[PDB]
Write a protein that binds this ligand. Sequence first.
Ligand code: HEM
Ligand SMILES: N/N=c1\cc[nH]c2ccccc12
Length: 289
Amino acid sequence: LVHVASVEKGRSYEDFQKVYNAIALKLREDDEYDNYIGYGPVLVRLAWHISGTWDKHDNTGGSYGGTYRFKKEFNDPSNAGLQNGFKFLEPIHKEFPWISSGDLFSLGGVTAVQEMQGPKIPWRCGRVDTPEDTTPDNGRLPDADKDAGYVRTFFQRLNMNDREVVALMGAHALGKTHLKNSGYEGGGANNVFTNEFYLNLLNEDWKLEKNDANNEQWDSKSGYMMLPTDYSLIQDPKYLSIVKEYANDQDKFFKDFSKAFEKLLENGITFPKDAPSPFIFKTLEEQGL
Ligand code: HEM
Ligand SMILES: N/N=c1\cc[nH]c2ccccc12
């Protein structure tokens, strides 16, 4: 099973920068969503969940086919709440109907990370919409109630190593949990991309509690929370070393996150040797917009 990148006909960097800009302008405009968090974090989670269905063993799933647009995937319990990000993107797609679904969903995550002052994430075009019968079954995205061994094994299926896993999880500085979506109730909401996930893990006084959905989570007196899978990064000695590294080196975290997140979004895709180089989009701020 091979998925070859195919550039949308006649398109180049400037076309995609226009889509980036439309997403970024709408992020700025629709600021009230989710108690003024805005749509940045849910777009990051959307890009990760359309990519995190990938299976390295048979190349099923992943971002290429844009299959989150189909009912089976759209209605995955693991994806509860991402419909908000889909609705955000719908007018963007209407404005730029030439772009594929997979390219739009992944570009949404890149735009959100950069506009929230995160690292630049190089991004490649060419994902191609595939038919409904290529939609992966539910159950490929990870459980939150598990431990470090579960996290490590889970991410092997996405071809991610310990360093990549710990860097990707730093996205849990963003947004919040919602009891109605996932059975975890949130605290510590944020919409600026920093390494504070790692600082909070190491510096907060955590207490294991049972929430109103009967699930366990780690709560701090400051109002932050950690999933059991988050907290497992300081229970496992190999993860703990990397958590300490990122807590003490913002630039290293940004660089490692950028690589891992681009990789995540490109897993499963074969890029022709003549394909364009990855694009690095300017932020609105860099453009004076
Ligand atoms: C073991 C791996 C992971 C688990 C178990 C997990 C689990 C969860 C859960 C339960 C939520 C709360 C959803 C809600 O209630 O709305 C959440 C939110 C979120 N996750 Fe993860 N996640 C994992 C990895 C990742 C990765 C790899 C990324 C991206 C690089 C990511 C990005 C996000 C973001 C940005 C949010 C906030 C969404 C919002 O505010 O609407 N997560 N995650
Ligand atoms: N303090 N806990 C979080 C804050 C923002 N986003 C998250 C996403 C997943 C798990 C925990 C958090």
